Design a protein around this motif. Structure first.
Motif, PDB file in Angstrom:
ATOM      1  N   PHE B  17      77.066  26.215  31.926  1.00 27.68           N
ATOM      2  CA  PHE B  17      76.110  26.507  30.861  1.00 27.68           C
ATOM      3  C   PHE B  17      75.987  25.284  29.963  1.00 27.68           C
ATOM      4  N   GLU B  18      74.868  24.574  30.076  1.00 27.98           N
ATOM      5  CA  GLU B  18      74.603  23.395  29.265  1.00 27.98           C
ATOM      6  C   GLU B  18      73.974  23.833  27.948  1.00 27.98           C
ATOM      7  N   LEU B  19      74.714  23.660  26.856  1.00 29.38           N
ATOM      8  CA  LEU B  19      74.276  24.034  25.514  1.00 29.38           C
ATOM      9  C   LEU B  19      74.153  22.756  24.691  1.00 29.38           C
ATOM     10  N   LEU B  20      72.924  22.281  24.520  1.00 27.08           N
ATOM     11  CA  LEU B  20      72.634  21.065  23.774  1.00 27.08           C
ATOM     12  C   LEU B  20      72.045  21.414  22.413  1.00 27.08           C
ATOM     13  N   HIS B  21      71.808  20.374  21.612  1.00 25.95           N
ATOM     14  CA  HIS B  21      71.146  20.524  20.317  1.00 25.95           C
ATOM     15  C   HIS B  21      69.626  20.528  20.500  1.00 25.95           C
ATOM     16  N   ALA B  22      69.174  21.426  21.366  1.00 27.34           N
ATOM     17  CA  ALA B  22      67.763  21.614  21.659  1.00 27.34           C
ATOM     18  C   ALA B  22      67.488  23.103  21.791  1.00 27.34           C
ATOM     19  N   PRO B  23      66.243  23.528  21.584  1.00 27.66           N
ATOM     20  CA  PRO B  23      65.924  24.953  21.734  1.00 27.66           C
ATOM     21  C   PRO B  23      66.322  25.470  23.111  1.00 27.66           C
TER      22      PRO B  23
ATOM     23  N   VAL D  69      44.580   4.001  23.504  1.00 34.88           N
ATOM     24  CA  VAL D  69      45.878   4.584  23.187  1.00 34.88           C
ATOM     25  C   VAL D  69      45.958   4.737  21.675  1.00 34.88           C
ATOM     26  N   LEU D  70      46.037   5.983  21.209  1.00 39.92           N
ATOM     27  CA  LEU D  70      45.989   6.279  19.789  1.00 39.92           C
ATOM     28  C   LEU D  70      47.356   6.732  19.283  1.00 39.92           C
ATOM     29  N   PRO D  71      47.692   6.457  18.024  1.00 39.16           N
ATOM     30  CA  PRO D  71      48.954   6.965  17.480  1.00 39.16           C
ATOM     31  C   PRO D  71      48.949   8.483  17.400  1.00 39.16           C
ATOM     32  N   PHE D  72      50.147   9.051  17.284  1.00 39.21           N
ATOM     33  CA  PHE D  72      50.310  10.494  17.170  1.00 39.21           C
ATOM     34  C   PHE D  72      50.643  10.951  15.759  1.00 39.21           C
ATOM     35  N   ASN D  73      51.386  10.149  15.001  1.00 42.77           N
ATOM     36  CA  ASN D  73      51.750  10.476  13.617  1.00 42.77           C
ATOM     37  C   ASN D  73      52.483  11.815  13.647  1.00 42.77           C
ATOM     38  N   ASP D  74      52.125  12.781  12.803  1.00 40.00           N
ATOM     39  CA  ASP D  74      52.798  14.071  12.746  1.00 40.00           C
ATOM     40  C   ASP D  74      52.025  15.170  13.466  1.00 40.00           C
ATOM     41  N   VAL D 173      44.772  21.424  18.795  1.00 38.34           N
ATOM     42  CA  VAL D 173      45.659  20.916  17.759  1.00 38.34           C
ATOM     43  C   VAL D 173      47.038  20.780  18.377  1.00 38.34           C
ATOM     44  N   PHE D 174      47.591  19.571  18.337  1.00 39.52           N
ATOM     45  CA  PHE D 174      48.912  19.289  18.875  1.00 39.52           C
ATOM     46  C   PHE D 174      49.832  18.922  17.723  1.00 39.52           C
ATOM     47  N   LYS D 175      50.952  19.632  17.608  1.00 40.94           N
ATOM     48  CA  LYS D 175      51.887  19.412  16.510  1.00 40.94           C
ATOM     49  C   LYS D 175      53.307  19.402  17.053  1.00 40.94           C
ATOM     50  N   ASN D 176      54.022  18.303  16.835  1.00 43.37           N
ATOM     51  CA  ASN D 176      55.407  18.158  17.272  1.00 43.37           C
ATOM     52  C   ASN D 176      56.306  18.286  16.051  1.00 43.37           C
ATOM     53  N   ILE D 177      56.998  19.417  15.936  1.00 38.91           N
ATOM     54  CA  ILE D 177      57.867  19.688  14.796  1.00 38.91           C
ATOM     55  C   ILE D 177      59.146  20.341  15.296  1.00 38.91           C
ATOM     56  N   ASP D 178      60.289  19.846  14.819  1.00 39.12           N
ATOM     57  CA  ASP D 178      61.592  20.431  15.133  1.00 39.12           C
ATOM     58  C   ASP D 178      61.806  20.538  16.641  1.00 39.12           C
ATOM     59  N   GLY D 179      61.448  19.478  17.364  1.00 39.06           N
ATOM     60  CA  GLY D 179      61.622  19.467  18.801  1.00 39.06           C
ATOM     61  C   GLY D 179      60.739  20.434  19.553  1.00 39.06           C
ATOM     62  N   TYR D 180      59.760  21.037  18.888  1.00 43.98           N
ATOM     63  CA  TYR D 180      58.833  21.973  19.508  1.00 43.98           C
ATOM     64  C   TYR D 180      57.432  21.383  19.487  1.00 43.98           C
ATOM     65  N   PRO D 205      46.796  30.281  18.685  1.00 42.57           N
ATOM     66  CA  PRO D 205      47.875  29.527  19.337  1.00 42.57           C
ATOM     67  C   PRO D 205      47.769  29.634  20.849  1.00 42.57           C
ATOM     68  N   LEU D 206      47.843  28.486  21.519  1.00 42.22           N
ATOM     69  CA  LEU D 206      47.770  28.457  22.974  1.00 42.22           C
ATOM     70  C   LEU D 206      49.163  28.516  23.592  1.00 42.22           C
ATOM     71  N   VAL D 207      50.045  27.593  23.207  1.00 46.02           N
ATOM     72  CA  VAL D 207      51.411  27.622  23.725  1.00 46.02           C
ATOM     73  C   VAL D 207      52.325  26.690  22.941  1.00 46.02           C
ATOM     74  N   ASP D 208      53.572  27.106  22.747  1.00 46.11           N
ATOM     75  CA  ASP D 208      54.602  26.269  22.145  1.00 46.11           C
ATOM     76  C   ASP D 208      55.682  26.012  23.184  1.00 46.11           C
ATOM     77  N   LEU D 209      56.117  24.759  23.290  1.00 46.07           N
ATOM     78  CA  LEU D 209      57.050  24.344  24.319  1.00 46.07           C
ATOM     79  C   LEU D 209      58.272  23.685  23.695  1.00 46.07           C
ATOM     80  N   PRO D 210      59.479  23.945  24.212  1.00 44.96           N
ATOM     81  CA  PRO D 210      60.694  23.301  23.686  1.00 44.96           C
ATOM     82  C   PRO D 210      61.016  21.982  24.391  1.00 44.96           C
ATOM     83  N   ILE D 211      60.074  21.039  24.340  1.00 46.54           N
ATOM     84  CA  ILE D 211      60.284  19.764  25.023  1.00 46.54           C
ATOM     85  C   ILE D 211      61.355  18.944  24.315  1.00 46.54           C
ATOM     86  N   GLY D 212      61.327  18.914  22.984  1.00 49.05           N
ATOM     87  CA  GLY D 212      62.337  18.206  22.222  1.00 49.05           C
ATOM     88  C   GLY D 212      62.369  16.710  22.466  1.00 49.05           C
TER      89      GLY D 212
END
Ligand SMILES: *[C@@H]1O[C@H](CO)[C@@H](O)[C@H](O)[C@H]1NC(C)=O
Ligand SMILES: *[C@@H]1O[C@H](CO)[C@@H](O)[C@H](O)[C@H]1NC(C)=O
Ligand SMILES: *[C@@H]1O[C@H](CO)[C@@H](O)[C@H](O)[C@H]1NC(C)=O
Ligand SMILES: *[C@@H]1O[C@H](CO)[C@@H](O)[C@H](O)[C@H]1NC(C)=O
Ligand SMILES: *[C@@H]1O[C@H](CO)[C@@H](O)[C@H](O)[C@H]1NC(C)=O
Ligand SMILES: *[C@@H]1O[C@H](CO)[C@@H](O)[C@H](O)[C@H]1NC(C)=O
Ligand SMILES: *[C@@H]1O[C@H](CO)[C@@H](O)[C@H](O)[C@H]1NC(C)=O
Lengths: 49, 167, 49, 270
Positions: B17-23, D69-74, D173-180, D205-212
């Motif tokens: 179980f990999e538990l990182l500081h990510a969601p 290629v454009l910046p992303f900012n917040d 609308v694309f928003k990267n906040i708190d690794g989401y 809202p379309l979808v939120d992803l935990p890409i981080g």
């Protein structure tokens, strides 16, 4: 013309709203939700908040 | 196939179980109990905990919305995560409890008023007035002057065997 | 007890606060998001060295 | 796949426009009815300078017009006005190379593919579709976006569908906040021929992803129609800022109107 009464009503309501909204203020604690603190931290930690 | 158990093949699976500081992305089976309605229960929807009465709702939630708040920002509605049906949350019945008592020097019999609660949530000569549920008062059609003002135009007096009559 | 007296005069005395504390607790969570494929590993017909 | 090299590379100059009162998205999944609520979040300020350009999907004719290629900012608000689905995908990252993790969000003819991997993006990412005369339908047959993709960190493929190969305005609308990474989207039938239409419309809202992952730049991907041998789509970009908004939810929970507090003193009073 009825403003004198209306304002009165509003004022009272306003106070209540403020009072209710004061339940959503952290006041420095980790969170304003008491159940979250209780369920996430042990009582020794919880009491401080 | 004829080797000893020590020399026989064994299939091994190791679950790490990999538990990182990510969601997180993997969770175990969510323990969901049967839904209960029209009764003050301690509900929990997707980590949102609360206590209240869950009832069938007519609100037209949008597909993407999971909760419903109000001016107080308190959870007024929810969506059942398993079956996509909306439920209204009502505060668990509560209210002041007062005691309509003629002077103890006069009598020890008293009536109990539960302010602003329907006469259904009380454990157990029951009158349902707008002020609340009055228990121990005999409703009287006759109207006299106000003696012990309960409220909503209802006043209770100790009168003729004698009992407390609300009118 | 509320009046701190042994003689109670005629009236209505707010004594207590009545609540209806819940009989039971109910938990509802999303049953399915996606099936983790443990069977593909455990029930694989052939294993690796 | 193998990158397709173009000897001649060019990009059209940018242009500027007024954002009017667009870019409002539901901040939370809460339901509010016939109320006004004040939210402090990353919004597109009303009447903000929006940088818009055109994406050429046909050559006619050996010049490759590449997007910038454009910046992303917040966070970024990205509007696309087109007849056919010319804009197909986006690439996000800091270096946009194998050195650092990069994200690719595309909507091909089959389904929507979202991959977070150490991509090595091509200099001129190319998607090519040819008209099947026998079948009387276009069919995508070329996909050369990244030379390599290693150490993939996330993958998500939506269910297969058939994309169709009076204009359509697709706001995102694309928003990267708190690794989401949160994506809001809205689709409207717009009859305007040119320019960003003036109006208000909330974005579901379309979808939120935990890409981080860390994102600072991005780019747009267009579709190319291979022909044996003019109405190019247009896209606008604005940058979100931390703003206080007053949103008006109608009886059905829809954000009918929004007010930008910092826009002008009247809105501050509101
Ligand atoms: C999960 O809940 C949905 C809601 O109706 C149901 O359709 C589905 O069959 C359920 N799946 C399992 C595995 O219980
Ligand atoms: C009880 O009340 C009556 C009149 O209401 C009075 O005459 C009597 O003295 C009272 N008794 C006591 C013990 O105070
Ligand atoms: C109490 O509940 C019953 C049934 O739920 C309802 O008919 C009645 O109107 C309620 N009382 C009040 C005062 O609303
Ligand atoms: C009071 O009068 C109403 C109609 O006038 C009647 O329905 C009710 O039963 C009466 N109550 C008593 C206690 O007699
Ligand atoms: C493997 O498959 C068998 C039947 O083919 C089934 O009974 C068993 O539950 C499966 N095991 C797992 C871990 O899915
Ligand atoms: C947007 O920027 C351009 C140049 O950067 C400027 O000429 C124009 O006035 C700006 N828009 C507004 C509304 O000020
Ligand atoms: C809210 O949605 C319902 C759904 O049918 C619709 O009938 C109603 O007209 C809508 N309300 C308004 C104000 O448009």
């Amino acid at each position: 013309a009825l403003g004198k009464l209306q304002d009165v009503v509003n004022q009272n309501a306003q106070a209540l709203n403020t009072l209710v909204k004061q339940l959503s203020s952290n006041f420095g604690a980790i969170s304003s939700v008491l159940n979250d603190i209780l369920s996430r931290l042990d009582p020794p930690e919880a009491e401080v908040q | 196939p004829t080797y000893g158990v020590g020399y026989q093949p064994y299939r091994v699976v190791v679950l790490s179980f990999e538990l990182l500081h990510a969601p997180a992305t993997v969770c175990g089976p969510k323990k969901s109990t049967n839904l209960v309605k029209n009764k003050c229960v301690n509900f929990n929807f997707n980590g949102l905990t609360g206590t209240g009465v869950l009832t069938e709702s007519n609100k037209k939630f949008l597909p993407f919305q999971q909760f419903g708040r109000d001016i107080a920002d308190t959870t007024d509605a929810v969506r059942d995560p398993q079956t996509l049906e909306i439920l209204d949350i009502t505060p668990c019945s509560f209210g002041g409890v007062s005691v309509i008592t003629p002077g103890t020097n006069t009598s020890n019999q008293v009536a109990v008023l539960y302010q602003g609660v329907n006469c259904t949530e009380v454990p157990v000569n029951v009158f349902q007035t707008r002020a609340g549920c009055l228990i121990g008062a005999e409703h009287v059609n006759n109207s006299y002057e106000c003696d012990i003002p309960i409220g909503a135009g209802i006043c209770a007096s100790y009168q003729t065997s004698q009992s407390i009559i609300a009118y | 007890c509320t009046l701190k007296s042994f003689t109670v005069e005629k009236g209505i005395y707010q004594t207590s606060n009545f609540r209806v504390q819940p009989t039971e607790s109910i938990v509802r969570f999303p049953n399915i998001t996606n099936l983790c494929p443990f069977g593909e590993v455990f029930n694989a017909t052939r294993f690796a060295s | 796949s193998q990158c397709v090299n173009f000897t001649t590379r060019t990009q059209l100059p940018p242009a500027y426009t007024n954002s009017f009162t667009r870019g409002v998205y539901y901040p939370d999944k809460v339901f509010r009815s016939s109320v006004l609520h004040s939210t402090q979040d990353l919004f597109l300020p009303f009447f903000s300078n929006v940088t818009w350009f055109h994406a050429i999907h046909v050559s006619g004719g050996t010049k490759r017009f590449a997007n910038p290629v454009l910046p992303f900012n917040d966070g970024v608000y990205f509007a696309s006005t087109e007849k056919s689905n010319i804009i197909r995908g986006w690439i996000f990252g800091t270096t946009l190379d194998s050195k650092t993790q990069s994200l690719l969000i595309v909507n091909n003819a089959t389904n929507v593919v979202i991959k977070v991997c150490e991509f090595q993006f091509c200099n001129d990412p190319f998607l090519g579709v040819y008209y099947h005369k026998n079948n009387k339908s276009w069919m995508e047959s070329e996909f050369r976006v990244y030379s390599s993709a290693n150490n993939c960190t996330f993958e998500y493929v939506s269910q297969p569908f058939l994309m169709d190969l009076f204009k359509n305005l697709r706001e995102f609308v694309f928003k990267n906040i708190d690794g989401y990474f949160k994506i809001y989207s809205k689709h409207t039938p717009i009859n305007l021929v040119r320019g960003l239409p003036q109006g208000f419309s909330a974005l579901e809202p379309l979808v939120d992803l935990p890409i981080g992952i860390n994102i600072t730049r991005f780019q747009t991907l267009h579709i190319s129609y291979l022909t044996p041998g003019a109405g190019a789509a247009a896209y606008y970009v604005g940058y979100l800022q931390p703003r206080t908004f007053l949103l008006k939810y109608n009886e059905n929970g829809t954000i009918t109107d929004a007010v930008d507090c910092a826009l002008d003193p009247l809105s501050e009073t509101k």
